[PDB]
Amino acid sequence: MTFAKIKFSAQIRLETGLHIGGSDAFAAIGAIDSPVIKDPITNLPIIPGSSLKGKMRTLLAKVYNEKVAEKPSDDSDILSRLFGNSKDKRFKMGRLIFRDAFLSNADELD
RNA sequence: ACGGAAACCUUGAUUCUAACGCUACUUCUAAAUAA
Numbered sequence: 001m002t003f004a005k006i007k008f009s010a011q012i013r014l015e016t017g018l019h020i021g022g023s024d025a026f027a028a029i030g031a032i033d034s035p036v037i038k039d040p041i042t043n044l045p046i047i048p049g050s051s052l053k054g055k056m057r058t059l060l061a062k063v064y065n066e067k068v069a070e071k072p073s074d075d076s077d078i079l080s081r082l083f084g085n086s087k088d089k090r091f092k093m094g095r096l097i098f099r100d101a102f103l104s105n106a107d108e109l110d
Numbered sequence: 111a112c113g114g115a116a117a118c119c120u121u122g123a124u125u126c127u128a129a130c131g132c133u134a135c136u137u138c139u140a141a142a143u144a145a
Contacts, residue, residue, distance in 0.1 A: 022119045037119085054118035072116065086116035093115065 012047060012101055020051050044106065049098035057083045 023035035026043075036045050057079060061069045065076045073087045084094030 020119080024119090034119095048118090051118050054120095056118095058118070080116090084116060 011104070018045070018047070020045075020047055022048075039102070044103045046103075047101035049100045052101070053083060053096070053098045 018036070019034065020037050021034055022037040023030055026040045027035040027038045037048060038044060039046050057072070057075075060079055061075065064078045067074075067076070069075050073085060075083075075085065077091070080088065080091040080094075082094050082096045084096075085091040
């Protein structure tokens with residue numbers, strides 16, 4: 001059945017302080033010894049899509065993986081057909097296109 | 111037939127140890143002068 005794209009819009013609301021971290025160049029000057037990853041322009045906390053993708057894959061590896069996942073390349077067909085898999089024919093590119101997460105209630109916080 | 115595909119800046123770690131809201135202190139003194 002023909003092409004389709006389905007978008008799962010949501011609003012992540014931190015109930016506890018988030019520490020994705022990863023200060024490299026801009027956030028590296030944070031003077032905190034563990035700065036959260038920020039936007040280079042607006043200096044706003046950001047949840048990168050890699051964090052969501054990795055955490056979701058590692059969490060679903062405990063439910064939808066009948067064999068033990070020694071490596072992410074050896075993941076089950078279901079996980080590798082969504083998150084992708086570099087070492088197979090059909091599952092080279094996954095069906096999940098994650099996006100970064102930007103602050104949306106900055107005005108509310110003010 | 112995108113210098114592209116797969117990658118959690120993650121793992122553990124008590125803003126914790128010691129420290130008298132304490133010291134002296136009678137709810138008490140004075141009764142004049144007139145009758």
